[PDB]
């Protein structure tokens, strides 16, 4: 039932945002899940029976003790690992503005599918190195957004070096974002320096693929290094797992990896077709 799903997402996004501005976001969220109705039905009743996987919806499901997808969200993209492992090593790095940054680096090859609402990609990477990104998407901005996420996730020093101011991004409670989301917010604001300094390479013009230049125009001849746009589309089930959620709505899998947080919830939403009554 897609009207319910879409109304559920809208309600869930609104609730997660409001619960973020409190001394106990988990407690606030749960209260709001219990006090909110959609089409005249309590949200908890819908969450318990609705299969939608969306970041705010899954934060609410975790708060209620319900299983969600085992995939993590970064930059709005659901990352499903298809190779390599999760083990990471801390490193202090230095941005292009001479600000230090403590990041957690996986060593060794990994491979992911990135599934977004407006783009899909295959990401192959090694230690602090983008090997390949193959991305398809609905429009130029949506592909650019996937490319930015993938460059940040790569943790390549070219990307750290392209940072051009101090990084003091916060959430809705004015609490500072973690290092990778600092980097994500910076380049989401303006990616020109990152794209211009990343590097380009000649491409083999092959059917269904096209290059993409640092100014985000398609090219048959060159492309951002390691990046290709799929005109035919990248292909893409849900493993549902028991999760935990802490006071600040950070959701973790059994091994302690963070899957979701309020920072992974879209800032936009549709228009509900079922009436949502809050409180």
């Amino acid at each position: 039932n897609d009207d319910v799903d879409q109304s559920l997402i809208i309600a869930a996004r609104n609730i997660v945002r409001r619960a973020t501005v409190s001394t106990d976001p988990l407690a606030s969220l749960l209260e709001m899940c219990h006090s909110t109705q959609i089409g005249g039905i309590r949200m908890v009743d819908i969450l318990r029976q609705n299969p939608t996987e969306e970041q705010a919806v899954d934060i609410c499901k975790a708060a209620m003790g319900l299983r969600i997808s085992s995939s993590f969200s970064f930059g709005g993209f659901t990352f499903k690992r298809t190779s390599g492992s999760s083990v990471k090593k801390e490193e202090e790095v230095l941005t292009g503005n001479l600000q230090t940054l403590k990041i957690r680096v996986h060593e060794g090859y990994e491979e992911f599918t990135m599934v977004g609402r407006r783009a899909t990609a295959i990401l192959r990477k090694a230690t602090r190195r983008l090997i390949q990104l193959i991305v398809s998407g609905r429009d130029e901005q949506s592909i650019a957004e996937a490319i930015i996420v993938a460059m940040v996730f790569s943790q390549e020093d070219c990307m750290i070096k392209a940072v051009r101011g101090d990084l003091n991004f916060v959430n809705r409670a004015n609490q500072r974002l973690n290092p990778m989301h600092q980097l994500l917010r910076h380049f989401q604001k303006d990616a020109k320096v990152l794209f211009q300094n990343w590097g380009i390479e000649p491409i083999d013009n092959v059917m269904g693929m096209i290059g993409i230049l640092p100014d985000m125009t398609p090219s048959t001849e060159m492309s951002l290094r390691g990046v290709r746009v799929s005109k035919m589309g990248v292909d893409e089930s849900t493993e549902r797992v028991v999760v935990s959620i802490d006071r600040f709505l950070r959701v973790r899998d059994q091994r302690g990896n963070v899957l979701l947080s309020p920072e992974e919830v879209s800032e936009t939403q549709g228009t509900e077709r079922l009436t949502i009554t809050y409180s």
Partner: nanobody
Amino acid sequence: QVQLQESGGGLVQPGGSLRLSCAASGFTFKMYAMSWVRQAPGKGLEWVSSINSAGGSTSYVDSVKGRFTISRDNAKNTLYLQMNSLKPDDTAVYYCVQGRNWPYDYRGQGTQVTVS
């Protein structure tokens, strides 16, 4: 000889409705996903909605979700966009395109929509 021709734009008031049409020709329409994209004042080409070949599965940008409905009549080689609860920010030239992946090789001439 792929040809796309949009129809149905106009000047309307907030809260109003319009129905865009796009007649396709020069390809087997039934075998292609189709999309609507738009160019609002000051901006680039932004995707609005996609629909698969059979018509059963649809996708929308958040800003139109719950207000716009994409549909298609494969018998008549026509793509539609029902725009309800129109807002000033829906002002744009609306284009029909083949497929659902950017960059779009085939785009119509556009139909202007102005909500004021």
